[PDB]
Ligand binder design. Structure first.
Ligand code: HEC
Ligand code: HEC
Length: 125
């Protein structure tokens, strides 16, 4: 399932986009994100340390490499620490010949999964 099940992560990490599922980035990528929320893609996404710590635990514990080779890892080398799901080789492979300039214009960003996937919040893509 490609769904955030953790309530605090669901709340805090849906404030500005969809709460992205842990399974889509390796643990190192989640750590790096969670270590710099004051400088988060142009926004201040900083949290109180207690909330920050718990969210980091959940993301790392259910990351793409938390149960061996999740699909999202395909085409990654161990020295890659991607900070965007939308920059993964696996993501670009699934989207390349599928998204037209018009579909992309309407979504406004490949970060906006629900603009194209009605079931994105229930894990259906
Ligand atoms: C607003 C104050 C935000 C909060 C709270 C969180 N995030 Fe965020 N995030 C924000 C912006 C403006 C962007 C750029 C979107 C774009 O169109 O380029 C992002 C992006 C991400 C990503 C990358 C998405 C992708 O393209 O692959 C990830 C993985 C991500 N954000 C994670 C994340 C988490 C774990 C959060 C909770 C702690 C969280 N975000 C909150 C703005 C904001
Ligand atoms: C429109 C501009 C899109 C945005 C934004 C995102 N996705 Fe997407 N995605 C889009 C299309 C047209 C398709 C192909 C559908 C098909 O059946 O060919 C996809 C595909 C996926 C998939 C693969 C689904 C499967 O066949 O198993 C996944 C896992 C997926 N998309 C995830 C995903 C996420 C996490 C996004 C936000 C970060 C996202 N997509 C954005 C169109 C669009």
């Amino acid at each position: 399932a490609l769904v955030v099940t953790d309530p605090l992560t669901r709340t805090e990490c849906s404030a500005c986009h969809m709460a992205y599922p842990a399974a889509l980035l390796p643990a190192r990528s989640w750590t790096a994100l969670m270590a710099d929320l004051p400088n988060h893609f142009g926004e201040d996404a900083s949290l109180d340390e207690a909330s920050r710590g718990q969210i980091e635990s959940y993301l790392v514990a259910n990351a793409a490499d938390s149960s061996g080779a999740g699909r999202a890892l395909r085409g990654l080398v161990q020295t890659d620490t991607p900070l965007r799901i939308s920059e993964l080789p696996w993501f670009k492979r699934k989207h390349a010949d599928e998204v037209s300039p018009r579909m992309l214009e309407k979504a406004r960003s490949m970060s906006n999964c629900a603009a194209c996937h009605t079931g994105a919040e229930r894990g259906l893509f």
